[PDB]
Design a protein around this ligand. Structure first.
Ligand SMILES: *[C@@H]1O[C@H](CO)[C@@H](O)[C@H](O)[C@H]1NC(C)=O
Ligand SMILES: *[C@@H]1O[C@H](CO)[C@@H](O)[C@H](O)[C@H]1NC(C)=O
Ligand SMILES: *[C@@H]1O[C@H](CO)[C@@H](O)[C@H](O)[C@H]1NC(C)=O
Ligand code: NA
Lengths: 453, 441, 454, 456
């Protein structure tokens, strides 16, 4: 069996191995420095450390049989997977994480879990879980503040244990700076030890600093180093939250910059205020209906196969019901749905009046148009979704009775989203299909000689 | 004083704006200082009155003898006649604030006695401080130093106002009444400024507020100090991110090119040449491309910058001596700047010829010896070579000699293809160039 | 019957009228739930305000039952379809949960627990809708963003003040040095003192100043470490929001200063003479100071072609119809020609055109003043002003012309001109679809030249 | 010998001169202010100051013979280097850094090392070393946070020395704010002197301020000035770390903006969810395989010489293996590897089907294609890396029975990175080579009349 890393089973294993790594970091520094968790709940930590090492040897078995990409294909033979794993420096960190330092439990007698700090060497599975969760989730900023909160809680916890170990090494209650005398039953509880050390490290590493001041030189030096580490921690939190806030409303700032630039253009060029409130109402519609991005530059970073497949999946079954394109070739229709252009029309906007040059074909999507009667509000017929017009104006039939004119006044009743096939885009799509061009011209000539040629 | 003041090329107007800025900063600092602190005593009132009379003379000489004489632009053309400049000053929104500034409320010194709050309307002349800010931002080459100086001066001014408002709250609660108020021991302004510094930076370490007015004061002052510290960090972030935007953009594009070359296993000689190009392009241009800078400019400033750099060089060319000047201007606009490394070939012996090279800030060497490496001609900056290659068609011109770059040579390049795309608009100069090709070739 | 448009202004007036009791319900319901002298001492006031808030809440559910939505770009106006679309919405469950009568539990406890009205806090979406409709609506987006940040952290600081007072009531007042002091003492027993010291405690804690007394118990130590981590997050969002506000206030000025720095680095690199350097820097400072710094082709590009065509009608059409050759053309040709018009800006002393130049442009003067100077230098013959035009017969390329698309004038800019350019290629591309107007233009230009010189 | 300033030797000298400059800054301010460092370890500072001064004289003779670029080439005329150094303002700071003020040691008796503060005037070599190090390294943000940590350590150290000198000038132990009484053997050690002064400056300059408050107005003025200097310095440094973090994840912000824009497009336009899963899987591949930037924009600013060298270092051995591009000229192959355009294909993506318009020639790089059958996937030929197809589709020889059709169902087995030489790019690159164009038409006519053509 070969697990490939892009799957969901690899992510479920990344969760199942990120649990004992975070357990190893957090509770191994707490059991190393606090010395009553290790004494009291000893069989609980033996069961949890045994299950964590079972998950660690299962992780080195999974990393021996996980896939990788050469030439775009996932490698599926276990000999090459094991050779690619054993030539990696991550295999050295995994086998250094799996050394039995618990044999040192036979010498020092199980109260020293600092021998298991080699189990902290598998940090990369936790970082890989955070990266894969940051890609897989749909709340990246909420996960990023949760990950930053988890990182600074790890540093607050580690500095709590480091302060308790320094106050144990100097001596409990010998100074005003250190943790108090643990022979007193108020300070001697494990709850009071951990929660006051967490309070100390949170007052020190967030630069608030109302702790009792140091008296000895080691305590002064540790508080200087811990204050500089806390200043860098506060700068890291401020920079991460500030960049995340600037990423959360980059689209709102860019759209407000576009709105203010077009507003400065409209007060500079002395546009009349009916058109100014029409442009402001269209921008209010564009932000309220979440169509704020332009699809021409949205679909640019995709490759041409995915752009062509997306243009097939939106436009091609709508284009196949167009009466000139009912029997065209398939690659011609792929080129034509790549040549389609979206346009949004306001209510009351004329798509075409009677007598304009017909050089585009409009396919109605998400709209309702009306063939109004000669600068009037009276309507002959209403068009709907999926309909089309202007199809014979772009074909350029020789001897047309109309002569590429519209012969219809068409207004938009509500907000429309029409798809525009221009005449020049149709001709450059019909460059490499000349027989389809002759079939299109003959079909348009047949429709016109049915009506008026 | 000159019948007209340019206000852009005039440095004496910048000195006058410094004088009105000194008078305005005198008002905005020393009106709460005289208003709250007891420094305006009866044996000191002559110095304060002399300084206020000097600041009001500076305010009046601005309104009567300087600011009517300022030039401006009305519909494009520059206005220089004095009555129209005076009418433009009188119909401004500056003049309403200035005549509301010097409204003489000092005649209420007779009724209500001496009070510095009557001169508080003199703090409405902020527009001269903002014009001095704008002119000193414009005259400075590195304006982020003045942004840091302005942020520091705004911080010291808000700390001055916070020291004055704390000394007012100390005299309102009584000096030495509670533990939180100013006790009256040392200097008044220095210890109230110490309290304002430890409050508005949210340092703390002060005595705790005792009564309810002091808790409301410490609450609002700590909240305002949180927002002052936040605006200070945001101003320094904006100054650093705007100052190092071009360097970090250049480094991001260089690391993108380095990651692309490491993705495709391109050898380290080619990567060393690409890194040498990026280093010399940062050391010389301080930008990646001049083309994407120049394409955002309008066409007239593009034509002026193209004329002042290369039009004398192309008017030295005997091939384009006979041509019309508009086609020369379009080939000035369509020149492309390429940087050649030391030892790089701009012309290999036997390769195809398609380009005309205008060397600026470099040297190329025409290797034409018997063995092929003796330097025949060294072409310095301002030379044009390979211009006859633009007229041959098809295969046409092959380069007859090796031309290598001596050092870093910044060539300007006009292709045959872009010359033909220019010459489809100009048939007469095309006829002159083709008859010169038929004569010389 | 009556259907309110959600894009209208009456819907925004209702967003204000429903964002008032929602913010009231949040702020004063946690204050009355945790402070217990506001609830007891002001009972008829909160009965009047809670009856007014519930009247506004049932009017909100009848307004949301009669508000429109867009299908096919049209506003739905039948109340049965609006009521079914409201009934199949998750906001309807929050609205009827906001109108669940838990006030009968307010009847049985003796009107001293307003904790039962916390289902009234389930209409936060109307407050968020008022805030984002205000930030799109108003003219001060940065000032509203810092006001919204101040209001959000004031709600959080107020909720933490009530949480600290409830924790101090649960532990006991004055039993410890960390809690709120003994309320039987008449200095600390005032409700003004209670609320102002709790708000002061949470502003010290939630902005990481920490001038509070230190905790003495494990629950107080745990609440203080949780409150300090929440406070360093709150201070990080405050610094990040004010930093993004400062970066959004001067984004355009920093973009223009980056353009000025790049132009100055280009002119220092290419050894541009200092006369042109001062001219170009003074020209760009003019274009910034007169609020015309933006490029028209990049500004108008995000607009659709109908709005771009109508904007080009509203600027250039009535000045293009004053051109003698474009006086009588078809209207769609004039719409395509004002779409083809491109702007150019000129400095003082800049030549628009000299004699013997190939005339491929038709300049229309706007916001400028030109001068037909002689060949030796500046000597005015005709001073061209706003609304005027020249160079149309040069782009009309009349057959057998004695001028032969030349300029026949040296035209300099007196001040700062902003001309509109119609190229010869743009005229011919607009004249592809109009052959009849092309032959009418050529015959009109030929008749003008035959009247003058042909 | 003339030292080139862009060498490795010049950076080794920049390290060897940035060591005594940082030595002079740090250790000269604590020897000037602390007075037990200067009195106790005196011969150590005499040896270190003699080594720093002989490094300073070696620095001025290196700067007298260092190169500078004029017209793109390095000047090696040593008289020109000496005159260009002599007209520089760095030479004045160097000769003021090397005046013998240690002869002033003869009067004051060597306990006053503040006469060597002119030796602090060579700060430009330390700033030049930091600039060349962050230009040279491959961890620029790690060196920038390390440089900010070194700047706060120099500022905390200098403020510690300034606070100890102010406590010595006011008097030790006279106030609750100053450093305590040094005759007491607890406070009289040099370690507690430096470490408590460092503690005072770390508490004061970071605006935490848990020191004892001032009692005199000189101390109030110094603590106000020091709080202001500290809030300006640390607001600058927190803004610098914020700008550096915002430029560290700018590319992930741009890629997430592109992903969320294409996601909102696909939920807006009602695209089916199998294709939406294919697009999201391609974006997951593109982020997980570090291929987010694109070749056309990362090679947009380079000239065609270096783009030509980059492209012949990947494409030329594949392009020389093509049957029509076998014996072409070298400059034509340089133009053709400049004309190549990359396309990436998912697994199962059809490159071309039977009956498509053939106008591109695909060069396969990092991929495996398969010439499958029409109805099902029966792989006839599995094309590998370095292979090619469709050159007859871009030659368009007269009288072909294909008629620019593809005649093959070619779909990708895995992810492929194909490079496309279109017909328009080939016919544009052949405009300077008509003889090679006729050779290409004759070679394609040779292939097609070995297989299938009509004489038209
Ligand atoms: C801690 O307490 C025990 C007994 O309560 C006492 O013997 C010991 O000296 C104390 N430790 C210190 C450092 O005071
Ligand atoms: C509060 O004050 C009253 C009277 O002043 C006293 O009886 C009571 O014990 C005090 N409670 C506490 C907790 O101090
Ligand atoms: C410092 O200590 C010495 C002796 O221990 C004493 O004479 C001197 O007065 C002290 N200095 C101060 C300022 O108290
Ligand atoms: Na603080």
């Amino acid at each position: 069996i070969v697990v490939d890393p892009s799957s969901n089973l690899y992510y479920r294993w990344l969760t199942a191995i990120a649990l004992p790594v975070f357990y190893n970091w957090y509770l191994l520094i707490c059991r190393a420095c606090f010395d009553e968790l290790q004494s009291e709940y000893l069989m609980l930590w033996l069961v949890l450390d045994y299950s964590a090492d079972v998950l660690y040897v299962l992780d080195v078995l999974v990393r021996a049989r996980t896939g990788f990409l050469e030439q775009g294909l996932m490698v599926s033979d276990t000999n090459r997977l094991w050779q690619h794993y054993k030539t990696t420096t991550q295999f050295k960190l995994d086998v250094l994480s799996l050394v039995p330092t618990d044999l040192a439990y036979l010498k020092v007698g199980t109260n020293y879990p600092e021998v298991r700090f080699n189990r902290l060497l598998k940090f990369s599975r936790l970082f890989e879980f955070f990266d894969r969760t940051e890609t897989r989730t749909n709340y990246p900023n909420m996960f990023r503040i949760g990950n930053l909160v988890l990182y600074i809680l790890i540093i607050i916890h580690w500095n709590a244990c480091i302060y308790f170990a320094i106050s144990k090494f100097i001596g409990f209650g010998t100074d005003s700076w250190v943790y108090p005398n643990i022979s007193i039953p108020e300070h001697g509880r494990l709850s009071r030890k951990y929660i006051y050390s967490l309070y100390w490290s949170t007052l020190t590493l967030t630069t608030i600093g109302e702790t009792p001041p140091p008296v000895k030189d080691e305590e002064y030096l540790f508080v200087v180093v811990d204050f500089l580490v806390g200043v860098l921690i506060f700068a890291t939190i401020v920079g991460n939250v500030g960049s995340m806030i600037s990423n959360m409303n980059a689209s709102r700032a860019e759209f407000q910059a576009k709105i203010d630039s077009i507003k400065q253009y409209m007060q500079f060029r002395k546009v009349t205020k009916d058109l100014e409130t029409r442009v402001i109402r269209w921008f209010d519609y564009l932000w309220a209906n979440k169509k704020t991005v332009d699809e021409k530059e949205v679909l640019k970073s995709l490759p041409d196969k995915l752009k062509a497949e997306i243009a097939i999946n939106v436009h091609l079954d709508t284009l196949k019901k167009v009466r000139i394109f009912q029997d065209c070739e398939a690659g011609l229709l792929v080129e034509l749905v790549l040549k389609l252009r979206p346009t949004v029309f306001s209510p009351g906007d004329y798509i075409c009046k009677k007598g304009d040059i017909g050089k585009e074909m409009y396919i109605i999507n998400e709209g309702k148009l009306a063939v109004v009667a000669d600068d009037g509000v009276t309507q002959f017929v209403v068009l709907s979704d999926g309909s089309y017009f202007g199809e014979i104006s772009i074909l350029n039939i020789k001897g047309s009775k109309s002569g590429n004119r519209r012969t219809a006044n068409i207004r938009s009743i509500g907000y429309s989203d029409l798809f525009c096939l221009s005449k020049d885009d149709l001709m450059e799509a019909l460059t490499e299909y000349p027989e389809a061009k002759k079939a299109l011209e003959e079909k348009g000539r047949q429709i016109l000689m049915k009506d008026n040629l | 004083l000159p019948n007209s003041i340019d206000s852009y090329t005039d440095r004496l107007y910048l000195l006058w704006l410094l004088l009105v800025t000194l008078a305005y900063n005198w008002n905005c600092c020393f009106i709460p200082l005289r208003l709250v602190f007891p420094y305006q005593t009866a044996d000191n009132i002559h110095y304060w009155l002399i300084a206020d009379i000097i600041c009001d003379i500076i305010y009046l000489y601005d309104m009567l003898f300087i600011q009517p004489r300022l030039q401006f632009v009305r519909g494009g053309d520059i206005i220089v006649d004095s009555n129209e400049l005076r009418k433009h000053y009188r119909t401004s929104t500056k003049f309403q604030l200035d005549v509301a500034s010097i409204i003489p409320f000092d005649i209420c010194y007779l009724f209500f006695g001496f009070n510095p709050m009557f001169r508080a309307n003199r703090m409405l002349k902020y527009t001269s401080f903002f014009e001095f800010n704008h002119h000193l931002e414009s005259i400075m080459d590195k304006a982020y130093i003045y942004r840091v100086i302005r942020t520091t001066g705004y911080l010291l001014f808000i700390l001055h106002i916070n020291a004055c408002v704390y000394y007012w709250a100390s005299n309102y609660e009584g000096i030495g009444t509670t533990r939180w108020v100013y006790d009256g021991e040392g200097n008044e302004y220095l210890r109230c400024y110490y309290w304002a510094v430890r409050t508005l930076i949210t340092i703390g370490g002060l005595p705790e507020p005792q009564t309810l007015f002091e808790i409301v004061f410490q609450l609002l002052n700590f909240f305002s100090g949180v927002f002052v510290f936040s605006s200070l960090i945001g101003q320094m972030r904006d100054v650093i991110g705007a100052a190092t935007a071009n360097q970090n953009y250049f480094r991001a594009c260089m690391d993108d090119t380095i990651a692309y070359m490491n993705n495709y296993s391109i050898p380290k000689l080619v990567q060393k040449r690409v890194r040498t190009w990026y280093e010399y392009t940062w050391d010389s241009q301080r930008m990646l491309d001049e083309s994407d800078l120049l394409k955002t400019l309008p066409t007239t400033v593009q034509l002026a910058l193209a004329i002042d750099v290369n039009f004398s060089i192309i008017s030295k060319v005997d091939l384009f001596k006979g041509c019309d000047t508009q086609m020369i201007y379009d080939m000035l606009l369509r020149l492309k700047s390429v940087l050649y490394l030391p030892g790089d070939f701009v012309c290999k012996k036997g390769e195809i010829g398609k380009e005309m090279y205008i060397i600026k800030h470099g040297e190329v060497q025409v290797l034409g010896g018997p063995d092929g490496t003796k330097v025949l001609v060294t072409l310095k900056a301002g030379s044009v070579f390979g211009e006859i290659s633009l007229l041959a068609a098809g295969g046409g011109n092959r380069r007859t000699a090796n031309v290598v770059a001596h050092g870093f040579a910044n060539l300007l390049t006009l292709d045959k293809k872009t010359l033909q795309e220019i010459l489809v608009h100009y048939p007469d100069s095309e006829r002159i160039l083709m008859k010169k090709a038929r004569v010389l070739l």
